[PDB]
């Protein structure tokens, strides 16, 4: 009952392989810091920690296929796969956006349905909805924020929250 980075990938896999509902992916946003010389403040910034993707036009597909094999270097690429990939380079200032609001106030933010996403005022929820997601969840942990996404509409179950609680650190 005090997890470290070394089991993070296993814990993300456990969360959605064992979950009773059809979750598409899980992401862990890790806390980092950005000291601001101009004001002397040490602001929390959330960035990519790890992730686990489960899953289910011509120019776009070719653009996506070209980025994938270019990454492979150093057949279809689906909307949710792309969203997952694109997520890797996002970051969030504490209190800002879906992961940031979750962390700042130590919140569970559960957005179920297309309208909950588009009405959230969070650009990441808007983006997820564009890529076909209908449920997005952020849950604040001791070391960051766990995010879940699904192309299905999923209500908050105590079973899932029980799994989250058994797989991450809480203050």
């Amino acid at each position: 009952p005090q997890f470290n980075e070394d089991t993070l990938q296993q814990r993300l896999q456990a969360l959605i392989e064992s979950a009773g509902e059809n979750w598409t992916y899980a992401i862990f946003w890790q806390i980092s810091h950005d000291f601001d010389s101009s004001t002397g403040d040490n602001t929390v910034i959330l960035g990519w920690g790890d992730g686990y993707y489960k899953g289910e036009n011509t120019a776009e597909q070719e653009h996506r296929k070209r980025v994938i094999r270019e990454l492979n270097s150093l057949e279809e690429v689906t909307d949710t796969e792309w969203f997952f990939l694109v997520s890797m380079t996002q970051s969030f200032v504490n209190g800002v956006g879906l992961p940031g609001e979750s962390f700042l106030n130590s919140r569970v933010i559960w957005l179920s349905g297309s309208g909950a996403l588009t009405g959230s005022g969070c650009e990441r929820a808007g983006q997820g909805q564009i890529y076909g997601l209908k449920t997005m969840v952020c849950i604040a942990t001791q070391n960051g924020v766990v995010e879940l996404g699904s192309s299905e509409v999923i209500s908050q179950s105590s079973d899932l929250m029980h799994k989250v609680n058994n797989l991450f650190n809480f203050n």
Partner: peptide
């Protein structure tokens, strides 16, 4: 660090996709 965290995750995702 985030960039190697990215690389590690990217590696796994690409590897798991080939399946």
């Amino acid at each position: 660090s985030v960039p190697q965290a990215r690389k590690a995750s990217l590696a796994r995702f690409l590897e798991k996709r080939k399946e």
